[PDB]
Amino acid sequence: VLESTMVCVDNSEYMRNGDFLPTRLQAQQDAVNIVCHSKTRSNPENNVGLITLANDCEVLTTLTPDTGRILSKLHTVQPKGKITFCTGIRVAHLALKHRQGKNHKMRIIAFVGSPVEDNEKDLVKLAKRLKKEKVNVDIINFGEEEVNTEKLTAFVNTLNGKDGTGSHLVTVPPGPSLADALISSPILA
C-alpha cells in the first residue's frame, strides 16, 4: 500500500551479542535489507527512512524512495549506548508527520533488541498518541523478549484497540536468523 515506513534500528550494547548469527547488529542489517526491499515492491512510491535507537536517537536518513542509501548508513552503525525506546518512537513519529506526500499512511518499524526501561503507564500513553494519528508501529521482540513480552504487549494491544490489525508484535525466538522469520511474519505480508 502507499505507505511511508521508518525503521527504528537498534545499535545498543546488546547488539554485539551472538545470540543471532553472526551478530545481532549484522542480523538486523539483513532484517532491514529484506523489510525495506519488501516495502519497495509493494508500492514504487513507498518511502523508507532510517532512525537510530541509541542512547540519543539520531535520524540517519529521512524518508526516501531509495533502498541503497538505507544500507550504506546501516554499514556505519556501530554498537554504542543504551536503548531509548520512549523517545525513539516520537522522533520517528515526528518524521512521519513531515513526509514527502501526505497521502501516505503511517508506519514505523522498530527493532527492539534491548529492554525498555520505562513504566507501563508511559508505554501505554505512547500507544494512545500513535492511535490518535493512525500510526502503526511494527515491532519485532527479538533479543530480550523474556522481559519485554509484557511491556510491548500493552503497546500493540492499546494501539490496535479492539478491531483492526494495524500493528503486529511478532516475536522471534533466538535462532539462525530473525530475518528468516520476517518473511513469514505479517509485517511483510
Partner 1 sequence: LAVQKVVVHPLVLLSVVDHFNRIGKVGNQKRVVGVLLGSWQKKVLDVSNSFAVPFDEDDKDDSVWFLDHDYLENMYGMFKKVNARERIVGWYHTGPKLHKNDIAINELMKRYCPNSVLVIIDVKPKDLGLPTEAYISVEEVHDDGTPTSKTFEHVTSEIGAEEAEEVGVEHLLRDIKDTTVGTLSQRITNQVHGLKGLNSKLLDIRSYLEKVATGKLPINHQIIYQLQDVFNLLPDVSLQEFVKAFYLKTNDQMVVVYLASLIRSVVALHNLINNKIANRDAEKKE
Integer CA distances (angstroms), 178 to 4, 68, 135, 175, in order: 23, 21, 24, 7
Work out whether 90 is an interface residue with partner 1 (CB under 8 A): yes
Per-residue cell: 76: 556505519
- Side chain identity at 152, as an amino acid letter? L
Q: How far is the CB of 157 from partner 1 (least distance, A)?
A: 24
* Nearest Cα residue to 28 out of 16, 42, 46: 16
134: phi then psi, degrees, rounded to nearest 5: 55, 40
Q: How far apart are CA 176 and CA 155, in angstroms?
A: 27
Work out whether 122 is an interface residue with partner 1 (CB under 8 A): no
* Nearest Cα residue to 81 out of 16, 155, 146: 16
Work out whether 108 is an interface residue with partner 1 (CB under 8 A): no
Residue of 32, 54, 77, 95 interacting with partner 1 (CB under 8 A): 95
The residue count for binding partner 1 (CB under 8 A) is 13
With respect to partner 1, which residue has the nearer C-beta, 91 or 127? 91
Distance of CA 6 to the CA centre of its chain: 7
Work out whether 82 is an interface residue with partner 1 (CB under 8 A): no
Q: How far is the CB of 6 from partner 1 (least distance, A)?
A: 10
- Residue 134 DSSP label: T
Q: How far apart are CA 88 and CA 31, in angstroms?
A: 19
Work out whether 87 is an interface residue with partner 1 (CB under 8 A): yes
With respect to partner 1, which residue has the nearer C-beta, 98 or 162? 98
CB under 8 A: which stretch of 85-93, 134-142, 150-158, 180-188 binds partner 1?
A: 85-93
With respect to partner 1, which residue has the nearer C-beta, 87 or 103? 87
Work out whether 132 is an interface residue with partner 1 (CB under 8 A): no
CB under 8 A: which stretch of 25-33, 55-63, 139-147, 149-157 binds partner 1?
A: 55-63
108: phi then psi, degrees, rounded to nearest 5: -130, 130
Work out whether 121 is an interface residue with partner 1 (CB under 8 A): no
Q: Where on the chain is the footprint of partner 1 (CB under 8 A)?
A: 56-57, 59, 61-62, 64, 87, 90-91, 94-95, 97-98
